Design a protein around this ligand. Structure first.
Ligand SMILES: [Cl-]
Ligand SMILES: [Mg+2]
Length: 275
C-alpha cells in the first residue's frame, strides 16, 4: 500500500518551483493515446514531458501529439525500420539551446533510446535503458551499455548540472521492488544491473531524487507487469527515476510517483525544481 504525498512546491530554502518535468514509459504512443494518456498529460501540464518506448518507427506522428497545448517544441528519436527500435520523445514549452540524439557510441545508438536537451541552467537527458532480456540474454550487452552511458553522462555533467529521467530498467535496492528474493535472476534486479546503477550514481555523480526525499518509504513502484493483475496487488518495481547532479539538490522541491495515472504498464513520475 502506497500513497504519494501531496506535491511539495518549494525548495529547502523556500524558493517557489519554477520547473515541472514529467517522465513516462508509455508502452507505445498509440496504445497510450487510446488509454487516455494524453488527457492525463494535459491535466499535469508540465513544462517538459519525456516519453519512453513510443514504438514510433513510422514517420507519421499522431495529430493529437503536435496539437498538445503548450508543449510546442517536440523532439523524437528519428523514425527507423530497425529491428529492436524503441523510440523516445522529449516535448517542451521552451525551445532548448541544443538537442542531441544518442550517446556517441554506435553500438548503443541504433534503437532510439536517448535524447539530450540543453537549457541555460542545466541539461536534460531522457533515456530508455535496454532491458537485460528474458533469461538474461542481453545482460552482457547491458553491461557495455551501462559503462558507455555512465561515461557519456559524466561528460555532460562536467559542463552543466544534469537531470536524467526515464526508465532505467533497474531497481536499485530491495525496497525498490515487491519481490526482491524471487528476482535476483531476472532482468532489472541482477547484481550486475544493481552494480551498474551504483557506479552511475557515484561516477557522474548523481542523486536519486525520490529516494533522497523519501529514504524509508516502501511499496513505491513505477512499473507493474500486465501479467496476473500485478498492479491490483501492487506487485511492482521502481524503474523510473529522476537523477540529479548534487548541485541541483538545493533546487529540488519534490519527486512524485503518479501511482493512479492509467495509460501504460508504467505510471508517470514528476519532478519539481526551483531554478
Ligand atoms: Cl528494452
Ligand atoms: Mg513496454
Amino acid at each position: 500500500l502506497y500513497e504519494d504525498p501531496p506535491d511539495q512546491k518549494t525548495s529547502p530554502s523556500g524558493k517557489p518551483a519554477t520547473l515541472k518535468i514529467c517522465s513516462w514509459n508509455v508502452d507505445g504512443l498509440r496504445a497510450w493515446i487510446k488509454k487516455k494518456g494524453l488527457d492525463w498529460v494535459k491535466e499535469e501540464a508540465p513544462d517538459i514531458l519525456c516519453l519512453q518506448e513510443t514504438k514510433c518507427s513510422e514517420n507519421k506522428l499522431p495529430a493529437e501529439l503536435q496539437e498538445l497545448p503548450g508543449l510546442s517544441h517536440q523532439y523524437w528519436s528519428a523514425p527507423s525500420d530497425k529491428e529492436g527500435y524503441s523510440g523516445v520523445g522529449l516535448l517542451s514549452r521552451q525551445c532548448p539551446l541544443k538537442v542531441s540524439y544518442g550517446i556517441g557510441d554506435e553500438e548503443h545508438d541504433q534503437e532510439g533510446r536517448v535524447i539530450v536537451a540543453e537549457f541555460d541552467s542545466f541539461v536534460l537527458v531522457t533515456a530508455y535503458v535496454p532491458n537485460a532480456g528474458r533469461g538474461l540474454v542481453r545482460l552482457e550487452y547491458r553491461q557495455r551499455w551501462d559503462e558507455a552511458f555512465r561515461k557519456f553522462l559524466k561528460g555532460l555533467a562536467s559542463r552543466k548540472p544534469l537531470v536524467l529521467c526515464g526508465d532505467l530498467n533497474v531497481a536499485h535496492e530491495e525496497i525498490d521492488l515487491r519481490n526482491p528474493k524471487g528476482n535476483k535472476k531476472n532482468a532489472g534486479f541482477t547484481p550486475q544491473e544493481r552494480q551498474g546503477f551504483g557506479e552511475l550514481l557515484q561516477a557522474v555523480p548523481l542523486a536519486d531524487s525520490f529516494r533522497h526525499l523519501y529514504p524509508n518509504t516502501p511499496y513505491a513502484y513505477t512499473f507493474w507487469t500486465y501479467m496476473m493483475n500485478a498492479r491490483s496487488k501492487n506487485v511492482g518495481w521502481r524503474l523510473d527515476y529522476f537523477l540529479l547532479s548534487h548541485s541541483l539538490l538545493p533546487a529540488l522541491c519534490d519527486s512524485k510517483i503518479r501511482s493512479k495515472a492509467l495509460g501504460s504498464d508504467h505510471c508517470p513520475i514528476t519532478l519539481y525544481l526551483a531554478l
